[PDB]
Amino acid sequence: RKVRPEELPALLEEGVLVVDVRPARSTPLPFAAEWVPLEKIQKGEHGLPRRPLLLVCEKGLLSQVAALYLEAEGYEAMSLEGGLQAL
Amino acid sequence: MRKVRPEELPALLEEGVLVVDVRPASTPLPFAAEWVPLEKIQKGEHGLPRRPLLLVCEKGLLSQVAALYLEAEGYEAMSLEGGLQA
């Protein structure tokens, strides 16, 4: 499921874990996010907690893919529609 | 560092704090924890987000150190008192 900018305030307060999937990262990070590059998520070499995860990226290209990879492993992932630019 | 009593646990978890299991490779992990070794934290080579953290381990010893460490880096890290077994 995608998350439109207007739905963020609700998720944030609920303490959603924000995960940055960008590579080794232009636009600032308005969230206390944990950085896990897609490259690494594609290799299963990460250690994200078994909890809802909001993946973000520059334009929404990488987060949506990674959002898929995590879905298979059993994760409850989601992404910010439009990336950090929709903001 | 803040010694979380099992009694205040529900209150914290309801907030959404990120739980971190520091035990190295023994009670179950009743939290959607993120495993981060103590040594990995002592070296600052951890990647925990800048959000309230609650450390946990077996007897509450290890988690009490990583807390001091992470606290130094401007982190709000607390420790589950008594550890997991308690």
PDB file of C-alpha atoms in Angstrom:
ATOM      1  CA  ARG A   1       0.000   0.000   0.000  1.00  0.00           C
ATOM      2  CA  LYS A   2       1.186   3.470  -0.960  1.00  0.00           C
ATOM      3  CA  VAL A   3       1.092   6.382   1.513  1.00  0.00           C
ATOM      4  CA  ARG A   4       0.107   9.868   0.364  1.00  0.00           C
ATOM      5  CA  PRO A   5       1.857  12.801   2.154  1.00  0.00           C
ATOM      6  CA  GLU A   6      -1.375  13.681   3.958  1.00  0.00           C
ATOM      7  CA  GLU A   7      -1.544  10.264   5.655  1.00  0.00           C
ATOM      8  CA  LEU A   8       1.978  10.495   7.050  1.00  0.00           C
ATOM      9  CA  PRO A   9       1.151  12.599  10.148  1.00  0.00           C
ATOM     10  CA  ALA A  10      -1.102   9.777  11.330  1.00  0.00           C
ATOM     11  CA  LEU A  11       1.447   7.013  10.786  1.00  0.00           C
ATOM     12  CA  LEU A  12       4.336   8.994  12.248  1.00  0.00           C
ATOM     13  CA  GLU A  13       2.513   9.560  15.558  1.00  0.00           C
ATOM     14  CA  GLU A  14       1.761   5.830  15.692  1.00  0.00           C
ATOM     15  CA  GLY A  15       5.530   5.380  15.646  1.00  0.00           C
ATOM     16  CA  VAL A  16       5.860   3.699  12.245  1.00  0.00           C
ATOM     17  CA  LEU A  17       9.402   2.652  11.459  1.00  0.00           C
ATOM     18  CA  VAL A  18      10.600   4.655   8.464  1.00  0.00           C
ATOM     19  CA  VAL A  19      13.160   2.909   6.269  1.00  0.00           C
ATOM     20  CA  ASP A  20      15.292   4.714   3.708  1.00  0.00           C
ATOM     21  CA  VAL A  21      16.092   2.446   0.765  1.00  0.00           C
ATOM     22  CA  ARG A  22      18.176   4.967  -1.197  1.00  0.00           C
ATOM     23  CA  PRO A  23      21.778   4.092  -2.226  1.00  0.00           C
ATOM     24  CA  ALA A  24      24.922   5.542  -0.611  1.00  0.00           C
ATOM     25  CA  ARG A  25      20.574  10.411  -0.960  1.00  0.00           C
ATOM     26  CA  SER A  26      19.852  13.974  -2.104  1.00  0.00           C
ATOM     27  CA  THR A  27      16.676  15.320  -0.498  1.00  0.00           C
ATOM     28  CA  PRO A  28      16.727  15.571   3.346  1.00  0.00           C
ATOM     29  CA  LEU A  29      15.054  13.003   5.609  1.00  0.00           C
ATOM     30  CA  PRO A  30      12.012  14.370   7.498  1.00  0.00           C
ATOM     31  CA  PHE A  31      11.875  11.088   9.408  1.00  0.00           C
ATOM     32  CA  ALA A  32      14.040   9.364  11.976  1.00  0.00           C
ATOM     33  CA  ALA A  33      14.715   6.665   9.398  1.00  0.00           C
ATOM     34  CA  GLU A  34      17.004   3.690   9.305  1.00  0.00           C
ATOM     35  CA  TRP A  35      19.053   3.432   6.106  1.00  0.00           C
ATOM     36  CA  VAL A  36      18.906   0.073   4.314  1.00  0.00           C
ATOM     37  CA  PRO A  37      19.884   0.400   0.627  1.00  0.00           C
ATOM     38  CA  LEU A  38      17.762  -1.555  -1.850  1.00  0.00           C
ATOM     39  CA  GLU A  39      20.947  -3.236  -3.082  1.00  0.00           C
ATOM     40  CA  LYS A  40      21.267  -4.805   0.381  1.00  0.00           C
ATOM     41  CA  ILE A  41      17.554  -5.555   0.744  1.00  0.00           C
ATOM     42  CA  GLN A  42      17.778  -7.400  -2.578  1.00  0.00           C
ATOM     43  CA  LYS A  43      20.475  -9.567  -1.007  1.00  0.00           C
ATOM     44  CA  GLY A  44      18.380 -10.252   2.083  1.00  0.00           C
ATOM     45  CA  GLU A  45      21.372  -8.916   4.037  1.00  0.00           C
ATOM     46  CA  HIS A  46      19.396  -6.576   6.313  1.00  0.00           C
ATOM     47  CA  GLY A  47      17.887  -6.834   9.772  1.00  0.00           C
ATOM     48  CA  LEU A  48      14.688  -4.830   9.801  1.00  0.00           C
ATOM     49  CA  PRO A  49      12.388  -5.515  12.772  1.00  0.00           C
ATOM     50  CA  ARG A  50       9.249  -7.588  12.242  1.00  0.00           C
ATOM     51  CA  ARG A  51       7.014  -4.545  12.309  1.00  0.00           C
ATOM     52  CA  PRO A  52       5.267  -2.233   9.826  1.00  0.00           C
ATOM     53  CA  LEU A  53       7.868  -0.486   7.694  1.00  0.00           C
ATOM     54  CA  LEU A  54       7.567   2.686   5.655  1.00  0.00           C
ATOM     55  CA  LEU A  55      10.186   2.660   2.929  1.00  0.00           C
ATOM     56  CA  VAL A  56      11.119   5.972   1.361  1.00  0.00           C
ATOM     57  CA  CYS A  57      13.299   7.166  -1.466  1.00  0.00           C
ATOM     58  CA  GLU A  58      14.040  10.131  -3.695  1.00  0.00           C
ATOM     59  CA  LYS A  59      11.099   9.709  -6.109  1.00  0.00           C
ATOM     60  CA  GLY A  60       9.360   6.469  -5.108  1.00  0.00           C
ATOM     61  CA  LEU A  61      11.167   4.165  -7.551  1.00  0.00           C
ATOM     62  CA  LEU A  62      13.412   2.184  -5.205  1.00  0.00           C
ATOM     63  CA  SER A  63      11.069   2.076  -2.206  1.00  0.00           C
ATOM     64  CA  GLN A  64       8.253   0.476  -4.206  1.00  0.00           C
ATOM     65  CA  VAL A  65      10.555  -2.318  -5.407  1.00  0.00           C
ATOM     66  CA  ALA A  66      12.084  -2.870  -1.970  1.00  0.00           C
ATOM     67  CA  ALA A  67       8.546  -2.638  -0.662  1.00  0.00           C
ATOM     68  CA  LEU A  68       7.975  -5.776  -2.724  1.00  0.00           C
ATOM     69  CA  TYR A  69      11.078  -7.710  -1.635  1.00  0.00           C
ATOM     70  CA  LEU A  70      10.103  -7.254   2.022  1.00  0.00           C
ATOM     71  CA  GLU A  71       6.531  -8.358   1.258  1.00  0.00           C
ATOM     72  CA  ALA A  72       7.731 -11.838   0.297  1.00  0.00           C
ATOM     73  CA  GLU A  73       9.796 -12.359   3.452  1.00  0.00           C
ATOM     74  CA  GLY A  74       6.585 -11.687   5.337  1.00  0.00           C
ATOM     75  CA  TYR A  75       7.097  -8.005   6.138  1.00  0.00           C
ATOM     76  CA  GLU A  76       4.252  -5.503   6.293  1.00  0.00           C
ATOM     77  CA  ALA A  77       5.868  -2.831   4.128  1.00  0.00           C
ATOM     78  CA  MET A  78       4.544   0.299   2.395  1.00  0.00           C
ATOM     79  CA  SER A  79       6.003   3.266   0.520  1.00  0.00           C
ATOM     80  CA  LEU A  80       5.590   7.033   0.254  1.00  0.00           C
ATOM     81  CA  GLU A  81       3.858   7.750  -3.046  1.00  0.00           C
ATOM     82  CA  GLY A  82       5.999  10.091  -5.110  1.00  0.00           C
ATOM     83  CA  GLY A  83       9.008   9.648  -2.872  1.00  0.00           C
ATOM     84  CA  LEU A  84      10.319  12.484  -0.746  1.00  0.00           C
ATOM     85  CA  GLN A  85       9.504  14.858  -3.617  1.00  0.00           C
ATOM     86  CA  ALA A  86       5.724  14.539  -3.297  1.00  0.00           C
ATOM     87  CA  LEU A  87       6.464  16.501  -0.128  1.00  0.00           C
TER      88      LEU A  87
ATOM     89  CA  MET B   1      20.036   4.814  32.066  1.00  0.00           C
ATOM     90  CA  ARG B   2      16.257   4.457  32.345  1.00  0.00           C
ATOM     91  CA  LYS B   3      15.567   1.024  33.798  1.00  0.00           C
ATOM     92  CA  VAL B   4      12.227  -0.031  32.291  1.00  0.00           C
ATOM     93  CA  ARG B   5      10.201  -2.103  34.713  1.00  0.00           C
ATOM     94  CA  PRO B   6       8.175  -4.961  33.171  1.00  0.00           C
ATOM     95  CA  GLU B   7       5.168  -3.062  34.537  1.00  0.00           C
ATOM     96  CA  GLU B   8       5.771   0.028  32.399  1.00  0.00           C
ATOM     97  CA  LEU B   9       6.492  -2.148  29.362  1.00  0.00           C
ATOM     98  CA  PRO B  10       2.974  -2.052  27.803  1.00  0.00           C
ATOM     99  CA  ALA B  11       2.984   1.756  27.985  1.00  0.00           C
ATOM    100  CA  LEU B  12       6.252   1.988  26.054  1.00  0.00           C
ATOM    101  CA  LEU B  13       5.356  -0.579  23.388  1.00  0.00           C
ATOM    102  CA  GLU B  14       2.076   1.259  22.802  1.00  0.00           C
ATOM    103  CA  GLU B  15       4.170   4.330  21.954  1.00  0.00           C
ATOM    104  CA  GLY B  16       6.044   2.340  19.314  1.00  0.00           C
ATOM    105  CA  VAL B  17       9.605   2.400  20.685  1.00  0.00           C
ATOM    106  CA  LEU B  18      12.095   0.440  18.598  1.00  0.00           C
ATOM    107  CA  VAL B  19      13.140  -2.672  20.496  1.00  0.00           C
ATOM    108  CA  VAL B  20      16.711  -3.876  20.069  1.00  0.00           C
ATOM    109  CA  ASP B  21      17.929  -7.370  21.091  1.00  0.00           C
ATOM    110  CA  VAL B  22      21.614  -7.135  22.052  1.00  0.00           C
ATOM    111  CA  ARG B  23      22.165 -10.754  23.056  1.00  0.00           C
ATOM    112  CA  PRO B  24      24.878 -12.458  20.946  1.00  0.00           C
ATOM    113  CA  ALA B  25      24.406 -15.677  18.929  1.00  0.00           C
ATOM    114  CA  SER B  26      17.648 -17.512  26.877  1.00  0.00           C
ATOM    115  CA  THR B  27      13.982 -16.441  26.940  1.00  0.00           C
ATOM    116  CA  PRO B  28      11.827 -15.799  23.798  1.00  0.00           C
ATOM    117  CA  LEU B  29      11.886 -12.358  22.168  1.00  0.00           C
ATOM    118  CA  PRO B  30       8.339 -11.047  22.859  1.00  0.00           C
ATOM    119  CA  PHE B  31       9.068  -7.886  20.866  1.00  0.00           C
ATOM    120  CA  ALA B  32       9.282  -7.094  17.157  1.00  0.00           C
ATOM    121  CA  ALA B  33      12.944  -6.475  17.955  1.00  0.00           C
ATOM    122  CA  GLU B  34      15.812  -5.359  15.773  1.00  0.00           C
ATOM    123  CA  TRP B  35      18.921  -7.426  16.513  1.00  0.00           C
ATOM    124  CA  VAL B  36      22.021  -5.248  17.027  1.00  0.00           C
ATOM    125  CA  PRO B  37      25.064  -6.803  18.784  1.00  0.00           C
ATOM    126  CA  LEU B  38      26.562  -4.885  21.709  1.00  0.00           C
ATOM    127  CA  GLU B  39      30.043  -4.857  20.179  1.00  0.00           C
ATOM    128  CA  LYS B  40      28.460  -3.456  17.032  1.00  0.00           C
ATOM    129  CA  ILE B  41      27.093  -0.632  19.176  1.00  0.00           C
ATOM    130  CA  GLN B  42      30.279  -0.059  21.179  1.00  0.00           C
ATOM    131  CA  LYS B  43      31.964   0.728  17.861  1.00  0.00           C
ATOM    132  CA  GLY B  44      29.150   3.066  16.855  1.00  0.00           C
ATOM    133  CA  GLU B  45      28.867   1.005  13.681  1.00  0.00           C
ATOM    134  CA  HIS B  46      25.161   0.535  14.325  1.00  0.00           C
ATOM    135  CA  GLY B  47      22.427   2.165  12.269  1.00  0.00           C
ATOM    136  CA  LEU B  48      19.618   2.581  14.751  1.00  0.00           C
ATOM    137  CA  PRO B  49      17.305   5.512  13.963  1.00  0.00           C
ATOM    138  CA  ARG B  50      17.219   8.725  16.019  1.00  0.00           C
ATOM    139  CA  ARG B  51      14.117   7.678  17.896  1.00  0.00           C
ATOM    140  CA  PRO B  52      13.454   6.463  21.444  1.00  0.00           C
ATOM    141  CA  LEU B  53      15.123   3.079  21.871  1.00  0.00           C
ATOM    142  CA  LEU B  54      14.543   0.335  24.430  1.00  0.00           C
ATOM    143  CA  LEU B  55      17.392  -2.121  24.795  1.00  0.00           C
ATOM    144  CA  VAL B  56      16.842  -5.672  26.049  1.00  0.00           C
ATOM    145  CA  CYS B  57      18.847  -8.787  26.775  1.00  0.00           C
ATOM    146  CA  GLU B  58      18.942 -11.847  29.025  1.00  0.00           C
ATOM    147  CA  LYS B  59      19.551 -10.508  32.547  1.00  0.00           C
ATOM    148  CA  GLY B  60      19.511  -6.770  31.803  1.00  0.00           C
ATOM    149  CA  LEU B  61      23.299  -6.423  32.044  1.00  0.00           C
ATOM    150  CA  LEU B  62      24.383  -6.016  28.411  1.00  0.00           C
ATOM    151  CA  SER B  63      21.479  -3.734  27.461  1.00  0.00           C
ATOM    152  CA  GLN B  64      22.512  -1.408  30.294  1.00  0.00           C
ATOM    153  CA  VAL B  65      25.891  -0.744  28.670  1.00  0.00           C
ATOM    154  CA  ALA B  66      24.745  -0.230  25.079  1.00  0.00           C
ATOM    155  CA  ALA B  67      22.339   2.260  26.626  1.00  0.00           C
ATOM    156  CA  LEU B  68      25.196   4.306  28.060  1.00  0.00           C
ATOM    157  CA  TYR B  69      26.927   4.081  24.676  1.00  0.00           C
ATOM    158  CA  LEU B  70      23.907   5.055  22.569  1.00  0.00           C
ATOM    159  CA  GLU B  71      23.021   7.729  25.154  1.00  0.00           C
ATOM    160  CA  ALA B  72      26.357   9.387  24.415  1.00  0.00           C
ATOM    161  CA  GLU B  73      25.429   9.722  20.760  1.00  0.00           C
ATOM    162  CA  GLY B  74      22.378  11.793  21.600  1.00  0.00           C
ATOM    163  CA  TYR B  75      20.067   8.759  21.754  1.00  0.00           C
ATOM    164  CA  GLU B  76      17.222   8.247  24.209  1.00  0.00           C
ATOM    165  CA  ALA B  77      18.023   4.618  25.034  1.00  0.00           C
ATOM    166  CA  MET B  78      16.395   2.872  27.985  1.00  0.00           C
ATOM    167  CA  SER B  79      16.867  -0.647  29.329  1.00  0.00           C
ATOM    168  CA  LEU B  80      14.332  -3.364  30.187  1.00  0.00           C
ATOM    169  CA  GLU B  81      15.118  -3.885  33.873  1.00  0.00           C
ATOM    170  CA  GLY B  82      15.668  -7.497  34.872  1.00  0.00           C
ATOM    171  CA  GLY B  83      16.300  -8.296  31.234  1.00  0.00           C
ATOM    172  CA  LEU B  84      14.058 -10.723  29.382  1.00  0.00           C
ATOM    173  CA  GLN B  85      14.196 -13.647  31.849  1.00  0.00           C
ATOM    174  CA  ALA B  86      12.694 -11.318  34.465  1.00  0.00           C
TER     175      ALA B  86
END
